[model samples]
Target chain A: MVQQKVEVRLKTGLQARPAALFVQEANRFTSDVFLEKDGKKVNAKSIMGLMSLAVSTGTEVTLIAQGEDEQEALEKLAAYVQEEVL
Target chain B: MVQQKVEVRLKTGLQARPAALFVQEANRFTSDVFLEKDGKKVNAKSIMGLMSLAVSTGTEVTLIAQGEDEQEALEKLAAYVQEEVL
Candidate 1:
């Protein structure tokens, strides 16, 4: 498993449309990816799990991935949350 | 908005993988789709909201849609919930 701490820079954070898009991106890989905040972890590919975290702008989150594509998944997903826009 | 009552027949209900698949289906259309259970309504396309409902097998849910493709959305989503498998 690979994990990294990343900060959310998306102007709107991961909510509604942005969360949906992030989930979509996570679904692209075969790795099991998760996001953790406030000690809670959720499946990154599950929109419900992602939204339940209520990660807002500037909140630091932990990204964890495991599987054949763990490294790539972590890199891409980390970059995703740090971006200022979709 | 158009709403219809439907029963969930998927053996696993709308949880985890099934819920993710349902959300993916809801996102395919332009309409705003929502599922209501026990008087609580949530965006059908939002995995978190859908999961929060804890919809299990045999649960009756309300399927609602509003937008350019409301009818199509309602028809498809309703059928989705009634199916026996993914």
Candidate 2:
């Protein structure tokens, strides 16, 4: 298991389209990935789950993952949230 | 071949993540899907191509598809552009 806090630099701030894409990217990993914010956590592989968050631009989101591929999943998703333009 | 026009309602206007997800979705079918905007057309299956359009909120985009699943691809991609929220 691994965890990290990443600042979301996404221009869209993790809304519907960005959330859906983020979830899709997380699903590429075998690890159990989740995003935590404001004491709430949501599965990173489910579009609806991620979209349920009221995330906006410059939001800081914590990414959590468990399993063998957790490390890769962690970095990828964290970077995605922090740097993606959408 | 089939084609349809949809007004982009995405808040992010098809940037990195939104464009990536949109391309990924279009790739699910065998049809060749393309997006047309402002006299330019790009393959909908390519993330870079879609992002290159520089689409903004409230822009009208045309979805064109050719092949066996063209109709479904046209409708699906058109609806995505019209209704998705980034």
Q: How does each model score on lDDT?
A: 0.61, 0.61
Candidate 1: regions farther than 4 A off? A1-13, A84-86, B1-86
Would you list the clashing residue pairs of candidate 2? Answer: none
DockQ of candidate 2, scored on C-alphas against the true complex (2 decimals)? 0.02
Candidate 1 vs. true structure, TM-score:
0.42
Question: What DockQ class does candidate 2 belong to?
Answer: incorrect
Model 2 chain B lDDT-worst window of ten: B1-10
Give per-residue CA lDDT, model 1, range B5-44, as digits (tens): 1121111224445568778888899888777766777777
Minimum summed lDDT over a 10-residue window in model 1 chain B is located at: B1-10
- Evaluated at residue B68, the lDDT of candidate 1 is 87
Residue by residue across A1-86, what tens digits does model 1's lDDT show? Answer: 11111121111124455567778899998988887766777887986677565343455667788888777877777777666334
In terms of lDDT, model 1 sits at: 0.61
| Model 1, total clashes | 2
In candidate 2 chain A, where is summed lDDT lowest over 10 consecutive residues? Answer: A1-10
